[PDB]
Design a binder for this molecule. Structure first.
Ligand SMILES: *[C@@H]1O[C@H](CO)[C@@H](O)[C@H](O)[C@H]1NC(C)=O
Ligand SMILES: *[C@@H]1O[C@H](CO)[C@@H](O)[C@H](O)[C@H]1NC(C)=O
Lengths: 31, 36
């Protein structure tokens, strides 16, 4: 699954993304 | 993971829960029922 972490659009429009139990070397800054 | 089936981890690790029980246990050995 892919999850999106947001502080709320009434605070900011930045976003972070969690790729669930995927090794972070095969996803396709801060990794 | 199998086919479309996954298992999500719990938010509290086992280390955190053992920390919680040792804080309860040190509170009761040392203060009785006053800390609650
Ligand atoms: C939501 O927006 C309103 C007005 O734009 C503001 O008063 C309120 O503090 C905002 N809420 C948060 C959690 O920032
Ligand atoms: C992801 O793959 C690399 C390459 O084998 C490995 O070193 C790494 O440990 C893997 N990720 C995890 C969380 O083990």
């Amino acid at each position: 699954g892919v999850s999106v972490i947001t502080p709320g659009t009434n605070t900011s429009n930045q976003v972070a993304v969690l790729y669930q139990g995927v090794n972070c070397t095969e996803v396709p800054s801060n990794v | 993971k199998f086919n479309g089936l996954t298992v999500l981890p719990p938010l509290l690790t086992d280390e955190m829960i053992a920390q919680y029980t040792s804080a309860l246990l040190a509170g009761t050995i040392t203060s009785g029922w006053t800390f609650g």
